Design a protein around this ligand. Sequence first.
Ligand SMILES: *[C@H]1O[C@H](CO)[C@H](O)[C@H](O)[C@H]1NC(C)=O
Ligand SMILES: [Mg+2]
Ligand SMILES: [Mg+2]
Ligand SMILES: [Mg+2]
Ligand SMILES: [Mg+2]
Ligand SMILES: [Mg+2]
Ligand SMILES: [Mg+2]
Ligand SMILES: [Mg+2]
Ligand SMILES: [Mg+2]
Ligand SMILES: [Mg+2]
Ligand SMILES: [Mg+2]
Ligand SMILES: [Mg+2]
Ligand SMILES: [Mg+2]
Ligand SMILES: [Mg+2]
Ligand SMILES: [Mg+2]
Ligand SMILES: [Mg+2]
Ligand SMILES: [Mg+2]
Ligand SMILES: [Mg+2]
Ligand SMILES: [Mg+2]
Ligand SMILES: [Mg+2]
Ligand SMILES: [Mg+2]
Ligand SMILES: [Mg+2]
Ligand SMILES: [Mg+2]
Ligand SMILES: [Mg+2]
Ligand SMILES: [Mg+2]
Ligand SMILES: [Mg+2]
Ligand SMILES: [Mg+2]
Ligand SMILES: [Mg+2]
Ligand SMILES: [Mg+2]
Ligand SMILES: [Mg+2]
Ligand SMILES: [Mg+2]
Ligand SMILES: [Mg+2]
Ligand SMILES: [Mg+2]
Ligand SMILES: [Mg+2]
Ligand SMILES: [Mg+2]
Ligand SMILES: [Mg+2]
Ligand SMILES: [Mg+2]
Ligand SMILES: [Mg+2]
Ligand SMILES: [Mg+2]
Ligand SMILES: [Mg+2]
Ligand SMILES: [Mg+2]
Ligand SMILES: [Mg+2]
Ligand SMILES: [Mg+2]
Ligand SMILES: [Mg+2]
Lengths: 150, 48, 117, 110, 142, 56, 19, 103
Amino acid sequence: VTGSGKKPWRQKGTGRARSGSIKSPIWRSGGVTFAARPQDHSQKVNKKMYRGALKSILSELVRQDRLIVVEKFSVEAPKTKLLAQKLKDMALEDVLIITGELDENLFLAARNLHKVDVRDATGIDPVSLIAFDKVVMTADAVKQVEEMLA
Amino acid sequence: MRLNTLSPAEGSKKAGKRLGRGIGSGLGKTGGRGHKGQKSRSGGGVRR
Amino acid sequence: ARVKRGVIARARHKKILKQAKGYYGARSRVYRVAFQAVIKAGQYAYRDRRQRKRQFRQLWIARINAAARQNGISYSKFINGLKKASVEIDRKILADIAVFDKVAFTALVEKAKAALA
Amino acid sequence: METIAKHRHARSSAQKVRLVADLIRGKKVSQALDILTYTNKKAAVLVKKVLESAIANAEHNDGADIDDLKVTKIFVDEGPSMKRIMPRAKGRADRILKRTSHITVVVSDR
Amino acid sequence: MKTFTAKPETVKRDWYVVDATGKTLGRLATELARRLRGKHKAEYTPHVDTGDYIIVLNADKVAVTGNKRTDKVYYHHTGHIGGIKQATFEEMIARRPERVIEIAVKGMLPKGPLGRAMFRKLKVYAGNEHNHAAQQPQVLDI
Amino acid sequence: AVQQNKPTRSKRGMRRSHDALTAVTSLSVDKTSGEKHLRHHITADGYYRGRKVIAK
Amino acid sequence: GKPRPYSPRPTSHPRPIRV
Amino acid sequence: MYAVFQSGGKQHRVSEGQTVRLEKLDIATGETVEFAEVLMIANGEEVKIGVPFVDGGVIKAEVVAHGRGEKVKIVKFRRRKHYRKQQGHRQWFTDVKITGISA
RNA sequence: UGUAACGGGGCUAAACCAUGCACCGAAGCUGCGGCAGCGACGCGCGUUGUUGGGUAGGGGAGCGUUCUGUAAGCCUGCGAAGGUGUGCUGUGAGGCAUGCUGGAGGUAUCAGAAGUGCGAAUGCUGACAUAAGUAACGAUAAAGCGGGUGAAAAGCCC
RNA sequence: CCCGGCGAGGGGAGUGAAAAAGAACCUGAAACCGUGUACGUACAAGCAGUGGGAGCACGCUUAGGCGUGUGACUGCGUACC
Ligand SMILES: *[C@H]1O[C@H](CO)[C@H](O)[C@H](O)[C@H]1NC(C)=O
Ligand SMILES: [Mg+2]
Ligand SMILES: [Mg+2]
Ligand SMILES: [Mg+2]
Ligand SMILES: [Mg+2]
Ligand SMILES: [Mg+2]
Ligand SMILES: [Mg+2]
Ligand SMILES: [Mg+2]
Ligand SMILES: [Mg+2]
Ligand SMILES: [Mg+2]
Ligand SMILES: [Mg+2]
Ligand SMILES: [Mg+2]
Ligand SMILES: [Mg+2]
Ligand SMILES: [Mg+2]
Ligand SMILES: [Mg+2]
Ligand SMILES: [Mg+2]
Ligand SMILES: [Mg+2]
Ligand SMILES: [Mg+2]
Ligand SMILES: [Mg+2]
Ligand SMILES: [Mg+2]
Ligand SMILES: [Mg+2]
Ligand SMILES: [Mg+2]
Ligand SMILES: [Mg+2]
Ligand SMILES: [Mg+2]
Ligand SMILES: [Mg+2]
Ligand SMILES: [Mg+2]
Ligand SMILES: [Mg+2]
Ligand SMILES: [Mg+2]
Ligand SMILES: [Mg+2]
Ligand SMILES: [Mg+2]
Ligand SMILES: [Mg+2]
Ligand SMILES: [Mg+2]
Ligand SMILES: [Mg+2]
Ligand SMILES: [Mg+2]
Ligand SMILES: [Mg+2]
Ligand SMILES: [Mg+2]
Ligand SMILES: [Mg+2]
Ligand SMILES: [Mg+2]
Ligand SMILES: [Mg+2]
Ligand SMILES: [Mg+2]
Ligand SMILES: [Mg+2]
Ligand SMILES: [Mg+2]
Ligand SMILES: [Mg+2]
Ligand SMILES: [Mg+2]
């Protein structure tokens, strides 16, 4: 806190509570007793525990009929109207689309649909697998996610 | 399994002691340090 | 994440100030003084739930002692009499009868007098 | 029919002005005007102007007869205190409160 | 139900006249203090004056045992420094004989307002004649 | 010498039980002008007991 | 709140010496 | 006519058509209860004093309501010893309407 | 300092000794209703036993506050937060409903993180009391009156 | 427009969804100070409560208890840290 280290008044004789710094956290405008510093909130997750959790989540996404596996999922041109149309036909709104290699067109189409996310198999996080209503994996992607988790 | 239905295992998250927060808590006032002497003082305690 | 205490502190103080209604001066206006007063009211209330039972029995006995001495017997004899005659009507009821049904009470005093005879 | 007149931020402590207001509370306006006229207090001057204004308000705004008016409600609320430094002996300072008051008079035929 | 309480606007106070002639001061006082409070009545409430009116006659002739007639000393303090006054029982009986019953009964009555209201129902007289013919007091043998 | 205990708003009230102003009993009326005035004092217009003593 | 206290000013009477 | 019966560790002096608050009985809100252990019955001059019960003395009561009484704050406080404990309490009752006293 | 060496009144027993039989008397015990801990026994729920004054202090379990996710969801101008009443409710921290005020925010649930709870620190800042309408109005060189101006003149002007 | 000193301040009018949003301006808590109403209080002694409890006033749906306010009188009772 900005200020001098001058004792505000003498130790004895004034009839006031003894004071040492105008920056005392007891004082208005004083320091914060245990002032925050920037923190790293990152935790270590064991590799095996991370992979464990992915296997548990995917296994649940099958049991609750949320992992809708297809063979080929793309659009013709990079147009949001096309993917929106494809998703209303396939009959889902909120969905995570895991494809083998990330097709530029499907990436761009999805980008402006807030309920829709489009990732490559390398890019599956556990929160997204749980957050989305339905997960659409391409057969190609399931092979990679299998190979990836063993 | 949604983000608002995941719970931790029972006994995995014991809540930390909060000292000097009243009579009810059982760590009010002295906060478990007892009365006076070196061990009751901020930065108090003899070396190893 | 900073927490302002305003709303919660306000409510805690109101809680106490509401329990201090009717108290004299600072005791109904001043949190620091109302709190002490609400605690002490609590301590008296606890203590007096017991005292109430002592005070009522004492009253009942006084009234039974009046009504019995009217009928020409002390409370001590009369109660001893009621036990020998195996009457189990408790002092709250005796006292209530002594006021409201003086014929009935005389009956009870006769049954007492009989047992001692 | 009630009519109101306030003097807000009147220079005078409520305590001082309340001594005068207590004289005319419930009186007929005519009776009250007289009382105030022969009350040797600064506050009597203050309250007479607000009672005069109230009567004027009740004649001009509402079609009310001055002959029928009584002082129904009168009260004085503490106004903002102006804070001043008064130097005392030995280089010590006191803080003088110049106490202001809000004077409200309600006249009515009721 | 709640226990009965005597109500001070509906209570039947009765007039009694007692002759203190020969009676032992203390043993008379207790019986007076008992009836003034209403401790002889079923309706006895500790916060209501349920007691009776008692004319006491011949206060001057009240008896005491042993050498109390000469040796019982009544002390009071005037509230003035050194203001400790005393009167023997015989001096008190010579000068103000109603006070001897009144003092004795007053120490045997509850303290506080009701205690004082109770004492107001005791009419003490030094002679054999009272003014309360109108109240039609019953004779009481204590 | 100073208070050991803040006196109450009650005690303040009680001390001021004597602070109340007395309203003038009744004004007198001039026989001539008809003006109300303090008794034994001249009127505002300048009359006293019927006589015009001062010029305004 | 409270004003900053004054530096020592002159004293009318000496503190009584208990010694 | 009035009768004296024991229920819930307490005694009650009741007449026909009186509602009486007792300690909680384990009986539904419509059902009737018979108080058989009756200590006294009084019909003015006629007065039956039990020894300790009146032979063939019976009080037929209808259970009208169950419920919890007014809340009571229990406050424990040891001044200077850093000990304070508060507790609430509502006692269960059973209001019975006395339907018939029989000697 | 005042009786002042029965707590008082009073007492010749209302004192003392002896014997006896009654009664009063506690949050002790019993009765009735309720809650909780621990151990038994059955099978999470019964049954039974028993325990539940507490400082330092140890152990256990919770309430509520702000912030993140759940939430582009849900409540909200047909009235959010906040304020102030009332009612109900839980063993407690608390909770819920609702009148009035307010005029645009609020947020279940289950998790996550703490600037997370104040009556004291001759604590800090602001506000406001008290003493009190009290002390005081600063050199005891001194004023009086007429006129003027003015809403008003002891104080200004002549 | 009106009272007022060609004031301060206020009452109308008007603006505005709202002026108890009027610039000393969002909300507008508490201490603290008042006006009004109900009940209590001038023979009465102390941590000011609590247990008991009359009377009075008020509101309700038996015209009756019930609720609310007040609290004479009385047992117990020496704040907090
Ligand atoms: C006042 O006290 C101070 C110490 O605080 C000095 O002793 C000073 O000399 C004192 N003055 C008087 C007049 O005694
Ligand atoms: Mg800062
Ligand atoms: Mg790694
Ligand atoms: Mg501890
Ligand atoms: Mg310490
Ligand atoms: Mg030590
Ligand atoms: Mg130690
Ligand atoms: Mg240090
Ligand atoms: Mg914030
Ligand atoms: Mg209040
Ligand atoms: Mg100087
Ligand atoms: Mg006593
Ligand atoms: Mg002191
Ligand atoms: Mg005065
Ligand atoms: Mg401060
Ligand atoms: Mg002496
Ligand atoms: Mg016994
Ligand atoms: Mg007991
Ligand atoms: Mg026990
Ligand atoms: Mg125990
Ligand atoms: Mg314990
Ligand atoms: Mg917010
Ligand atoms: Mg949330
Ligand atoms: Mg904090
Ligand atoms: Mg504070
Ligand atoms: Mg503390
Ligand atoms: Mg001050
Ligand atoms: Mg003066
Ligand atoms: Mg003074
Ligand atoms: Mg003086
Ligand atoms: Mg002076
Ligand atoms: Mg001067
Ligand atoms: Mg002027
Ligand atoms: Mg002049
Ligand atoms: Mg001069
Ligand atoms: Mg000159
Ligand atoms: Mg203006
Ligand atoms: Mg706005
Ligand atoms: Mg505002
Ligand atoms: Mg306010
Ligand atoms: Mg007297
Ligand atoms: Mg009186
Ligand atoms: Mg006194
Ligand atoms: Mg006491």
